[PDB]
Structures are given as structure tokens and as C-alpha cells.
């Protein structure tokens, strides 16, 4: 495939947009970000980790609340997220203006996706560099992966970024849907540690979650991140050297 | 060879925009600008040695006032620099118009990030070549960097342009978080002499700052520069002895 990739209007002879395939490789050119689903809520983690110590990791983000019951994590450019999330935040709230109802996680996902689809349709507009994982609890917990193609796929545990691949191999073995919030939080922590090829710290992870039993966004404080991260690092150590 | 820098709308097979990454290396052709964050202020140092003895004392001059507690230095095309700085001002003054709230520094960096992304997404226009350091005290010191891509990164010391890499190492040893105002100001000069690889004088640089205690922007005069120069040169001499 050669020259069926320098315009977004141009399908290959094979049939598949290879322009979109590279915008889905742009997802994998950001860091790992993982969402793991419980029947208690939904937990969204992202590798908040930053290279030189001169940056302040805490203020660097990866992970925004969208609604007040929907959170999303990004992988892809920090730049392309900004437009996409600002759009999502406005959109998530516009529903609360014209139906007086917190937007359904699905609906949000469709609508973010409809926005992306418009940015990968016209020959004048570049595809989105990012994917979001859209994780909230609306009536039941849901955890979606939006695609730069502008497709949405239902997931029960998922990742995006460099670690997508490792996580897949992992959760194929150890993921179970009989996890509770706490078990899930641990498992979600274990998985990030496999991706990054090391032990985690509370000072270099951001975890946000939306519970069934409040339907309210919360960012786990550094203080309360500590217990979960201890039991998971021990598992992560066992796996990455027996 | 390749040809995914022929358009800003076209993704490489390397998952990236190589065009955004040469809008980054337009910043790196330009002259250095440095920010130092202390807990007591934010201090922005930028070059003004550029030109012969045939250019003014008072020539560019990098650290443009955006608000009465926000200054912003630039690196890259000074041409591209002005429009981003103008838009930067406009937005800052929009916040004060519509809320009566002196623009939050985090949120200013966010709104410039979206503006520089309008010029990334559309292909009838060209991305900016320029990185700005948005810096101010909204009620704590913050120093952020908005990239040619329009990407938000939080720093507690950085530089942009050619001097960056020398300076990255220098703060990685010396820079501390227990930093106070006097200290910060001498440290950032030290670092600026490394950048130009020679001794400093006060008139081949201009320095802006936003103090916590005043919470106003005040520009540094040549006279205010002098005591910092004298103390700084002690170390500039030691480390440029090869």
C-alpha cells in the first residue's frame, strides 16, 4: 500500500482506510490508559507519568471529568484531546440543558463519535489523533472505547495506548465480571503495572471513578490510592519475575 | 522517500504528524526563552542579544504582557509569535469581560491550546511554529507550556528554543522545590548563560516576572537585573570553563 494514505478520501485497493489506520496508530503513540468495569461502578486509570522531574505530574492529565457522572481518559495527543473533550464536555452538558437529564454514557459515546466521524469524512479535515475511553454509570455501568474512525465499541475492561496489547493478553486470563469495586481497582492497578513494565506509585497515576452508589465522579486522593497500589504492586512483581 | 509533511492533514505510517514535529523544530531554530517557577512567583527570562549594534536596546523583547498578572515569552517565528500572543491577550480580556475574573492561568493555557489546534486540524491553514510559556499567579504560581501542537504540559522550570536541552539538565541537578524568589531569579540567569554559552549582561536579555506578594506583573528593569547578574556570573564562569 502506497499512495492511498495521503488523503482521507482515498480507500485502498484492498478497502480499509489506511489514513484512519495511522490515526489509530496515533492512539498507540500515546501512553497506556486503562478502564476496568465492576458491577459497582467503573474505574478509569491513566499513566500520569512524565519523563523529566521538572514537570509536575499531578497537574498533567490524561483524564478529565466530562459530565458529573462521566469521566474519560485520553491516549493520543494531549493537544487533540483538548478539542475532543471540550466538545464532549459541552455536548455532555447540552443534554442536561434540553432534556434535563444527565447524558447517557452511550449517547455521549455516539455523539462524540458522530463528531469524530465528521472530522474523518470531509477531505478538508484531518482525523482525530486521539481515542477516548468513555466510562460512566448511567442506569448500569458502561465502559466504551471511541475510535478515531468514529466507531464505538462496548468493553468491560479495555485499554488504549502503548500498553493496549499487553493488557489484552493479561485480562484474557485474569479478568472476571464477578469483581466488586475494590477487587476491580486492584486488577486495574495490576494491569497498568504490566504495561509500564514496572511498579507503580501513587504519585505517578491518576485514578478517577464513577460509582453506582452516588453516580458522581471522584478523583481518588493520593492518600487513599496508597492501599490499593500496595497489593497490586506485589502481584505486578510476582508476574514480572517469578 | 516520504511525504506526510507535505500536508498537516496527513498522518504518517509512524502514527504521527511529521509536520507538527517540524513546527516543533521551528521553535528549536529560534532563540531561547526560559521559565523558572518558584513557590513565590514565576520568572521568565528570554534573549534580546539578537541583532548587531544596529538593532535597538528596546527591540524584541519577548515576554509580552497578556494580562496584569500574566506574561508570556515565545520561541519560534516572531511573526507567528505575535498573533498567538494577540489571541492570548484577547482571551484573557474576554474572561475579565464575561466574568470579571482575572483569567485563570490553567484556563488561559487551555484556550490557547484550542486556538493552536484550529490551525492544526484544518488544512487550509498552517500550524504554528511557536511555543509560548504561559505563566502567572492566579493565586498560586503556575508555569505551563503550550506546544506548536497545542499541547498542555505543566512545568516548574523549562526552556524553549535552542537552549532547552542544556537547561533541562541544569535544573534536573540544581532546581529545587524549596526555591524562594531571590534564589529563583539568580538560578534562572545561571541557566540562561549556559543557553547562550557565554557570560550574561543585563541589556542582552529582558526578564518579566509575576510575584505572588504583589500579584501583579512587573517588568524587570536593567537596574533590577544587576544584583542578579553579579551573583549569577560566579557560576556561569565555573561551568563554561571546559
Amino acid at each position: 500500500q502506497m499512495g492511498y494514505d495521503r488523503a482521507i478520501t482515498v480507500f485502498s485497493p484492498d478497502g480499509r482506510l489506511f489514513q484512519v489506520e495511522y490515526a489509530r496508530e496515533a492512539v498507540k503513540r500515546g501512553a497506556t490508559a486503562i478502564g476496568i468495569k465492576c458491577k459497582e461502578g467503573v474505574i478509569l486509570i491513566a499513566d500520569k507519568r512524565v519523563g523529566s522531574k521538572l514537570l509536575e505530574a499531578d497537574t498533567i492529565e490524561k483524564i478529565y471529568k466530562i459530565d458529573e457522572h462521566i469521566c474519560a481518559a485520553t491516549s493520543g495527543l494531549v493537544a487533540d484531546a483538548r478539542v475532543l473533550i471540550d466538545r464532549a464536555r459541552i455536548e455532555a452538558q447540552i443534554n442536561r440543558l434540553t432534556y434535563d437529564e444527565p447524558i447517557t454514557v452511550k449517547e455521549l459515546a455516539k455523539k462524540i463519535c458522530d463528531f469524530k466521524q465528521q472530522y474523518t469524512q470531509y477531505g478538508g479535515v484531518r482525523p482525530f489523533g486521539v481515542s477516548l475511553l468513555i466510562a460512566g454509570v448511567d442506569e448500569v455501568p458502561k465502559l466504551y472505547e471511541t475510535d478515531p474512525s468514529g466507531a464505538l465499541l462496548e468493553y468491560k475492561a479495555t485499554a488504549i495506548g502503548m500498553g493496549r496489547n499487553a493488557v489484552t493478553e493479561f485480562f484474557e486470563k485474569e479478568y472476571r465480571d464477578d469483581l466488586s469495586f475494590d477487587d476491580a481497582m486492584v486488577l486495574g492497578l495490576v494491569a497498568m503495572g504490566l504495561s509500564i513494565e514496572s511498579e507503580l506509585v501513587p504519585e505517578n497515576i491518576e485514578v478517577g471513578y464513577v460509582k453506582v452508589d452516588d453516580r458522581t465522579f471522584k478523583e481518588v486522593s493520593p492518600e487513599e490510592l496508597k492501599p490499593y497500589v500496595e497489593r497490586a504492586n506485589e502481584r505486578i512483581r510476582e508476574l514480572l519475575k517469578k | 522517500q516520504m511525504g506526510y509533511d507535505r500536508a498537516i492533514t496527513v498522518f504518517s505510517p509512524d502514527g504521527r504528524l511529521f509536520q507538527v514535529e517540524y513546527a516543533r523544530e521551528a521553535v528549536k531554530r529560534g532563540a531561547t526563552a526560559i521559565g523558572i517557577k518558584c513557590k513565590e512567583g514565576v520568572i521568565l527570562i528570554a534573549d534580546k542579544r539578537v541583532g548587531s549594534k544596529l538593532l535597538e536596546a528596546d527591540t524584541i523583547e519577548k515576554i509580552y504582557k497578556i494580562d496584569e498578572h500574566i506574561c508570556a515569552a515565545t520561541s519560534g517565528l516572531v511573526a507567528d509569535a505575535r498573533v498567538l500572543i494577540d489571541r492570548a491577550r484577547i482571551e484573557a480580556q474576554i474572561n475579565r469581560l464575561t466574568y470579571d475574573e482575572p483569567i485563570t492561568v490553567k484556563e488561559l493555557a487551555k484556550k490557547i491550546c484550542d486556538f493552536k489546534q484550529q490551525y492544526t486540524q484544518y488544512g487550509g491553514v498552517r500550524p504554528f511554529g511557536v511555543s509560548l510559556l504561559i505563566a502567572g499567579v492566579d493565586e498560586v504560581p503556575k508555569l505551563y507550556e503550550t506546544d506548536p501542537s497545542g499541547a498542555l504540559l505543566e512545568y516548574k522550570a523549562t526552556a524553549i528554543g535552542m537552549g532547552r536541552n542544556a537547561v533541562t539538565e541544569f535544573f534536573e541537578k540544581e532546581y529545587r522545590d524549596d526555591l524562594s524568589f531571590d534564589d529563583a531569579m539568580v538560578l534562572g540567569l545561571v541557566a540562561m548563560g549556559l543557553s547562550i554559552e557565554s557570560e550574561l549582561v543585563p541589556e542582552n536579555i529582558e526578564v518579566g516576572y509575576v510575584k505572588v506578594d504583589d500579584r501583579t506583573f512587573k517588568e524587570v528593569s536593567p537596574e533590577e537585573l544587576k544584583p542578579y547578574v553579579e551573583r549569577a556570573n560566579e557560576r556561569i564562569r565555573e561551568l563554561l570553563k571546559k
Binding site: 503513540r29 501512553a31 498533567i60 493520543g76 493537544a79 | 506546544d147 501542537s149 499541547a151
Partner: peptide, 9 residues
């Protein structure tokens, strides 16, 4: 390992 650019993080 430099660099992929810092606009992916």
C-alpha cells in the same frame, strides 16, 4: 530514545 515529541504523554 529522543524523541516522539512531548505532545504525546
Amino acid at each position: 530514545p529522543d524523541l516522539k515529541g512531548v505532545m504525546f504523554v
